[PDB]
Design a binder for this molecule. Structure first.
Ligand SMILES: [NH3+]NC(=O)Cc1nn[nH]n1
Ligand SMILES: [Cl-]
Ligand code: NA
Ligand code: NI
Ligand SMILES: [Zn+2]
Length: 330
Protein backbone atom coordinates (compact mmCIF):
# COMPACT_ATOMS: atom_id res chain seq x y z
CA UNK A 1 0.00 0.00 0.00
CA UNK A 2 1.24 3.40 -1.03
CA UNK A 3 1.91 6.18 1.51
CA UNK A 4 0.94 4.03 4.55
CA UNK A 5 1.94 6.82 7.01
CA UNK A 6 -0.49 9.22 5.24
CA UNK A 7 2.15 11.95 4.62
CA UNK A 8 1.31 15.01 2.56
CA UNK A 9 2.83 14.48 -0.83
CA UNK A 10 4.10 17.20 -3.17
CA UNK A 11 3.99 16.76 -6.94
CA UNK A 12 5.88 18.43 -9.75
CA UNK A 13 4.01 17.60 -12.99
CA UNK A 14 5.66 18.35 -16.24
CA UNK A 15 3.92 20.50 -18.80
CA UNK A 16 2.76 17.39 -20.58
CA UNK A 17 1.43 15.82 -17.39
CA UNK A 18 -0.43 19.09 -16.67
CA UNK A 19 -2.70 18.68 -19.67
CA UNK A 20 -5.19 16.08 -18.39
CA UNK A 21 -6.46 17.09 -15.03
CA UNK A 22 -8.40 13.99 -14.24
CA UNK A 23 -5.53 11.71 -15.27
CA UNK A 24 -3.14 13.50 -12.90
CA UNK A 25 -5.52 13.30 -9.93
CA UNK A 26 -5.77 9.50 -10.60
CA UNK A 27 -1.95 9.41 -10.80
CA UNK A 28 -1.56 11.11 -7.51
CA UNK A 29 -3.97 8.62 -5.93
CA UNK A 30 -1.99 5.76 -7.43
CA UNK A 31 0.95 7.07 -5.40
CA UNK A 32 -1.17 7.21 -2.17
CA UNK A 33 -1.60 10.95 -2.05
CA UNK A 34 -5.19 10.75 -0.94
CA UNK A 35 -4.27 8.92 2.27
CA UNK A 36 -3.06 12.22 3.72
CA UNK A 37 -6.23 14.10 2.86
CA UNK A 38 -4.27 16.86 1.13
CA UNK A 39 -1.57 17.14 -1.60
CA UNK A 40 0.42 20.01 -2.95
CA UNK A 41 0.87 20.47 -6.72
CA UNK A 42 3.60 22.78 -7.95
CA UNK A 43 2.84 23.80 -11.65
CA UNK A 44 5.57 23.42 -14.29
CA UNK A 45 7.65 26.41 -14.84
CA UNK A 46 6.07 27.07 -18.25
CA UNK A 47 2.64 27.57 -16.72
CA UNK A 48 0.91 30.68 -15.47
CA UNK A 49 -2.70 31.39 -14.24
CA UNK A 50 -2.95 34.81 -15.85
CA UNK A 51 -0.58 37.49 -17.01
CA UNK A 52 -0.58 39.92 -14.07
CA UNK A 53 -2.58 40.72 -10.95
CA UNK A 54 -2.25 44.49 -11.60
CA UNK A 55 -5.82 45.10 -12.41
CA UNK A 56 -7.85 43.27 -9.57
CA UNK A 57 -8.46 46.19 -7.16
CA UNK A 58 -12.01 46.94 -8.38
CA UNK A 59 -13.40 43.54 -7.61
CA UNK A 60 -16.04 43.90 -4.92
CA UNK A 61 -16.15 42.10 -1.62
CA UNK A 62 -19.92 42.53 -1.03
CA UNK A 63 -19.97 41.10 2.44
CA UNK A 64 -16.58 40.94 4.21
CA UNK A 65 -16.80 38.83 7.36
CA UNK A 66 -15.17 39.69 10.69
CA UNK A 67 -14.12 36.44 12.38
CA UNK A 68 -14.76 36.79 16.12
CA UNK A 69 -13.45 34.06 18.42
CA UNK A 70 -14.71 32.56 21.67
CA UNK A 71 -13.03 30.06 23.86
CA UNK A 72 -9.39 29.34 24.71
CA UNK A 73 -6.31 29.76 22.45
CA UNK A 74 -6.18 26.15 21.38
CA UNK A 75 -9.90 25.34 21.42
CA UNK A 76 -12.22 28.04 20.11
CA UNK A 77 -15.13 28.82 17.85
CA UNK A 78 -15.52 31.70 15.53
CA UNK A 79 -18.57 33.50 14.26
CA UNK A 80 -18.77 35.72 11.13
CA UNK A 81 -19.96 39.26 11.69
CA UNK A 82 -21.02 40.95 8.50
CA UNK A 83 -19.31 44.17 7.50
CA UNK A 84 -19.92 46.78 4.91
CA UNK A 85 -18.81 46.19 1.30
CA UNK A 86 -15.39 47.15 0.08
CA UNK A 87 -13.31 46.72 -2.96
CA UNK A 88 -10.26 44.45 -3.14
CA UNK A 89 -8.11 47.59 -3.13
CA UNK A 90 -9.74 48.86 -0.01
CA UNK A 91 -9.40 45.38 1.60
CA UNK A 92 -5.71 45.18 0.73
CA UNK A 93 -5.11 48.55 2.36
CA UNK A 94 -6.99 47.36 5.46
CA UNK A 95 -5.02 44.10 5.61
CA UNK A 96 -1.73 46.10 5.51
CA UNK A 97 -2.83 48.60 8.18
CA UNK A 98 -1.12 48.46 11.53
CA UNK A 99 -4.22 46.92 13.15
CA UNK A 100 -4.24 43.92 10.77
CA UNK A 101 -0.78 43.49 9.32
CA UNK A 102 1.31 40.38 9.83
CA UNK A 103 3.77 40.93 12.73
CA UNK A 104 7.47 40.66 12.30
CA UNK A 105 8.53 37.06 12.40
CA UNK A 106 11.50 34.81 11.75
CA UNK A 107 10.05 32.06 9.66
CA UNK A 108 6.79 30.11 9.06
CA UNK A 109 7.16 28.20 12.35
CA UNK A 110 7.55 31.44 14.40
CA UNK A 111 4.44 32.85 12.65
CA UNK A 112 2.52 29.63 13.36
CA UNK A 113 3.37 29.92 17.02
CA UNK A 114 2.18 33.53 17.05
CA UNK A 115 -1.02 32.53 15.28
CA UNK A 116 -2.00 29.88 17.86
CA UNK A 117 -0.89 32.04 20.80
CA UNK A 118 -2.70 35.15 19.79
CA UNK A 119 -5.51 34.42 17.25
CA UNK A 120 -8.38 34.69 19.70
CA UNK A 121 -7.45 38.16 20.77
CA UNK A 122 -8.05 39.66 17.36
CA UNK A 123 -10.90 39.63 14.89
CA UNK A 124 -9.54 39.66 11.30
CA UNK A 125 -11.77 40.38 8.30
CA UNK A 126 -12.06 37.78 5.46
CA UNK A 127 -13.55 38.11 1.93
CA UNK A 128 -14.87 34.67 1.30
CA UNK A 129 -16.93 32.73 -1.06
CA UNK A 130 -17.04 35.39 -3.80
CA UNK A 131 -18.26 33.68 -7.03
CA UNK A 132 -15.76 34.42 -9.79
CA UNK A 133 -12.43 33.47 -11.27
CA UNK A 134 -9.00 35.00 -11.85
CA UNK A 135 -7.75 32.41 -14.42
CA UNK A 136 -7.38 33.74 -17.81
CA UNK A 137 -9.72 32.11 -20.39
CA UNK A 138 -6.63 31.23 -22.40
CA UNK A 139 -5.10 29.13 -19.59
CA UNK A 140 -5.95 25.65 -20.67
CA UNK A 141 -4.28 23.59 -17.92
CA UNK A 142 -5.60 23.50 -14.37
CA UNK A 143 -8.09 26.34 -14.98
CA UNK A 144 -10.46 26.02 -12.01
CA UNK A 145 -13.42 27.40 -14.04
CA UNK A 146 -13.04 24.79 -16.74
CA UNK A 147 -12.93 21.47 -14.86
CA UNK A 148 -15.41 18.60 -15.32
CA UNK A 149 -18.64 19.39 -13.40
CA UNK A 150 -19.83 17.32 -10.51
CA UNK A 151 -23.19 17.03 -12.18
CA UNK A 152 -21.61 15.55 -15.29
CA UNK A 153 -19.56 13.18 -13.12
CA UNK A 154 -22.70 11.86 -11.43
CA UNK A 155 -24.33 11.45 -14.79
CA UNK A 156 -21.41 9.62 -16.20
CA UNK A 157 -21.11 7.27 -13.23
CA UNK A 158 -24.72 6.63 -12.30
CA UNK A 159 -26.64 7.54 -15.41
CA UNK A 160 -28.81 10.24 -14.27
CA UNK A 161 -29.14 13.76 -15.26
CA UNK A 162 -29.48 16.39 -12.64
CA UNK A 163 -29.84 20.13 -12.34
CA UNK A 164 -27.16 22.36 -10.83
CA UNK A 165 -23.97 24.14 -11.63
CA UNK A 166 -20.54 24.05 -10.06
CA UNK A 167 -18.42 27.49 -10.36
CA UNK A 168 -15.32 28.69 -8.56
CA UNK A 169 -15.01 31.04 -5.62
CA UNK A 170 -12.50 33.73 -4.71
CA UNK A 171 -11.14 34.38 -1.26
CA UNK A 172 -9.31 37.50 -0.08
CA UNK A 173 -7.44 36.95 3.18
CA UNK A 174 -5.43 38.73 5.74
CA UNK A 175 -3.23 37.80 8.71
CA UNK A 176 -5.09 35.45 11.11
CA UNK A 177 -8.06 34.81 8.79
CA UNK A 178 -9.04 31.30 9.60
CA UNK A 179 -10.73 28.30 8.04
CA UNK A 180 -12.31 26.02 10.64
CA UNK A 181 -12.09 22.23 10.71
CA UNK A 182 -14.27 20.69 8.01
CA UNK A 183 -14.71 18.30 5.18
CA UNK A 184 -16.31 19.55 1.97
CA UNK A 185 -20.01 19.39 1.24
CA UNK A 186 -20.92 15.78 0.47
CA UNK A 187 -17.29 14.87 1.22
CA UNK A 188 -16.24 16.21 -2.22
CA UNK A 189 -12.72 16.97 -3.31
CA UNK A 190 -11.54 20.55 -3.34
CA UNK A 191 -8.88 22.30 -5.29
CA UNK A 192 -7.33 25.60 -4.18
CA UNK A 193 -4.99 27.85 -6.05
CA UNK A 194 -3.10 30.65 -4.23
CA UNK A 195 -3.08 33.37 -6.86
CA UNK A 196 -1.25 36.19 -5.01
CA UNK A 197 0.23 37.25 -1.75
CA UNK A 198 1.13 35.72 1.50
CA UNK A 199 1.00 32.04 2.43
CA UNK A 200 -1.74 29.83 3.75
CA UNK A 201 -0.92 27.17 6.38
CA UNK A 202 -3.01 23.95 6.28
CA UNK A 203 -3.70 21.22 8.81
CA UNK A 204 -5.24 17.94 7.67
CA UNK A 205 -6.38 14.66 9.15
CA UNK A 206 -6.07 11.51 7.01
CA UNK A 207 -9.55 10.36 5.79
CA UNK A 208 -9.08 6.96 7.39
CA UNK A 209 -8.86 8.80 10.73
CA UNK A 210 -11.53 11.41 10.34
CA UNK A 211 -13.77 9.84 12.99
CA UNK A 212 -11.04 10.40 15.58
CA UNK A 213 -11.22 14.11 14.92
CA UNK A 214 -15.02 14.01 15.13
CA UNK A 215 -14.97 12.21 18.44
CA UNK A 216 -12.51 14.86 19.94
CA UNK A 217 -14.61 17.65 18.57
CA UNK A 218 -17.68 16.26 20.31
CA UNK A 219 -15.73 16.20 23.56
CA UNK A 220 -14.32 19.75 23.14
CA UNK A 221 -17.54 21.40 21.93
CA UNK A 222 -20.18 19.59 23.92
CA UNK A 223 -23.06 22.02 23.49
CA UNK A 224 -22.49 22.25 19.76
CA UNK A 225 -22.44 18.52 19.50
CA UNK A 226 -25.73 18.21 21.32
CA UNK A 227 -27.16 20.71 18.87
CA UNK A 228 -26.13 18.85 15.72
CA UNK A 229 -24.70 15.45 15.03
CA UNK A 230 -22.63 16.95 12.20
CA UNK A 231 -21.73 20.30 13.71
CA UNK A 232 -18.33 20.42 12.09
CA UNK A 233 -20.27 21.18 8.90
CA UNK A 234 -21.07 24.54 10.46
CA UNK A 235 -17.41 25.44 9.90
CA UNK A 236 -16.79 27.23 13.09
CA UNK A 237 -14.63 25.02 15.34
CA UNK A 238 -10.85 25.34 15.76
CA UNK A 239 -8.52 22.92 17.52
CA UNK A 240 -4.73 23.67 17.58
CA UNK A 241 -1.97 21.28 16.58
CA UNK A 242 -0.87 21.22 20.23
CA UNK A 243 -4.32 20.04 21.37
CA UNK A 244 -4.50 17.51 18.52
CA UNK A 245 -1.14 16.06 19.61
CA UNK A 246 -2.22 15.96 23.27
CA UNK A 247 -5.17 13.87 22.19
CA UNK A 248 -3.36 11.57 19.83
CA UNK A 249 -5.08 12.74 16.70
CA UNK A 250 -3.22 11.84 13.48
CA UNK A 251 -2.66 15.01 11.41
CA UNK A 252 -0.16 16.76 9.15
CA UNK A 253 0.64 20.39 8.29
CA UNK A 254 2.00 22.24 5.25
CA UNK A 255 2.29 25.78 4.04
CA UNK A 256 1.02 26.75 0.57
CA UNK A 257 2.70 29.62 -1.22
CA UNK A 258 1.55 31.80 -4.09
CA UNK A 259 1.51 29.89 -7.35
CA UNK A 260 0.82 26.52 -5.78
CA UNK A 261 -2.25 24.26 -5.85
CA UNK A 262 -3.59 22.27 -2.95
CA UNK A 263 -6.07 19.37 -3.47
CA UNK A 264 -8.18 18.09 -0.59
CA UNK A 265 -9.47 14.53 -0.89
CA UNK A 266 -12.86 13.10 0.10
CA UNK A 267 -13.37 13.09 3.85
CA UNK A 268 -10.04 14.81 4.55
CA UNK A 269 -10.72 17.22 7.39
CA UNK A 270 -8.79 20.39 7.09
CA UNK A 271 -8.30 23.81 8.80
CA UNK A 272 -5.80 26.60 8.58
CA UNK A 273 -4.94 30.25 8.42
CA UNK A 274 -3.58 32.99 6.15
CA UNK A 275 -0.30 34.72 6.83
CA UNK A 276 -1.14 38.11 5.40
CA UNK A 277 -2.91 39.67 2.41
CA UNK A 278 -3.67 37.04 -0.16
CA UNK A 279 -6.14 35.96 -2.79
CA UNK A 280 -7.07 32.28 -3.50
CA UNK A 281 -9.53 30.57 -5.80
CA UNK A 282 -11.18 27.23 -5.05
CA UNK A 283 -13.80 24.85 -6.30
CA UNK A 284 -15.15 21.47 -5.36
CA UNK A 285 -14.92 18.55 -7.73
CA UNK A 286 -15.63 14.82 -8.06
CA UNK A 287 -14.09 11.73 -9.52
CA UNK A 288 -15.45 8.21 -9.78
CA UNK A 289 -13.82 7.40 -6.45
CA UNK A 290 -15.86 10.09 -4.73
CA UNK A 291 -19.22 8.43 -5.37
CA UNK A 292 -18.81 6.06 -2.34
CA UNK A 293 -17.93 8.96 -0.10
CA UNK A 294 -20.92 10.98 -1.28
CA UNK A 295 -23.23 8.13 -0.51
CA UNK A 296 -21.92 7.97 3.05
CA UNK A 297 -21.38 11.68 3.90
CA UNK A 298 -22.88 12.99 7.07
CA UNK A 299 -25.27 15.72 6.88
CA UNK A 300 -26.31 18.65 8.95
CA UNK A 301 -30.06 18.92 9.23
CA UNK A 302 -30.25 21.43 12.13
CA UNK A 303 -30.41 24.49 9.99
CA UNK A 304 -27.12 26.05 10.71
CA UNK A 305 -25.26 24.75 7.68
CA UNK A 306 -26.97 26.37 4.74
CA UNK A 307 -25.84 25.40 1.28
CA UNK A 308 -25.94 25.83 -2.46
CA UNK A 309 -28.82 24.78 -4.49
CA UNK A 310 -26.50 22.18 -6.18
CA UNK A 311 -26.37 20.14 -3.10
CA UNK A 312 -29.99 19.14 -3.25
CA UNK A 313 -29.55 16.79 -6.13
CA UNK A 314 -26.57 15.09 -4.61
CA UNK A 315 -28.52 14.26 -1.40
CA UNK A 316 -31.63 13.37 -3.38
CA UNK A 317 -29.87 10.84 -5.64
CA UNK A 318 -27.11 9.52 -3.35
CA UNK A 319 -28.94 9.63 0.00
CA UNK A 320 -32.68 9.26 -0.63
CA UNK A 321 -33.37 8.02 2.95
CA UNK A 322 -31.85 11.22 4.37
CA UNK A 323 -33.27 13.69 1.86
CA UNK A 324 -36.53 14.68 3.55
CA UNK A 325 -34.83 15.49 6.83
CA UNK A 326 -31.98 17.34 5.19
CA UNK A 327 -34.46 19.36 3.11
CA UNK A 328 -36.32 20.41 6.19
CA UNK A 329 -33.00 21.73 7.49
CA UNK A 330 -32.67 23.74 4.42
N1 LIG B 1 -11.32 23.65 0.72
N2 LIG B 1 -10.54 24.70 0.95
C1 LIG B 1 -10.55 25.19 2.15
O1 LIG B 1 -11.22 24.80 3.06
C2 LIG B 1 -9.56 26.36 2.25
C3 LIG B 1 -10.19 27.65 2.66
N3 LIG B 1 -9.51 28.77 2.73
N4 LIG B 1 -10.35 29.65 3.17
N5 LIG B 1 -11.47 29.11 3.41
N6 LIG B 1 -11.36 27.82 3.11
CL1 LIG C 1 0.21 38.16 16.64
NA1 NA D 1 2.73 12.60 10.33
NI1 NI E 1 -12.31 23.16 2.51
ZN1 LIG F 1 -26.08 21.43 12.03
Amino acid sequence: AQNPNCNIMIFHPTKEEFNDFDKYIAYMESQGAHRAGLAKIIPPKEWKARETYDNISEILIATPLQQVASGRAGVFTQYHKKKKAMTVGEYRHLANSKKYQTPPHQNFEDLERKYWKNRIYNSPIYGADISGSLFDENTKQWNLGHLGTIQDLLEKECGVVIEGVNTPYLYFGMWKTTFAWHTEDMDLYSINYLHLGEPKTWYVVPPEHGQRLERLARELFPGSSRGCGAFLRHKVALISPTVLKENGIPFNRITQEAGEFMVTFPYGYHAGFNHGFNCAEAINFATPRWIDYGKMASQCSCGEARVTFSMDAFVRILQPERYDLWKRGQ
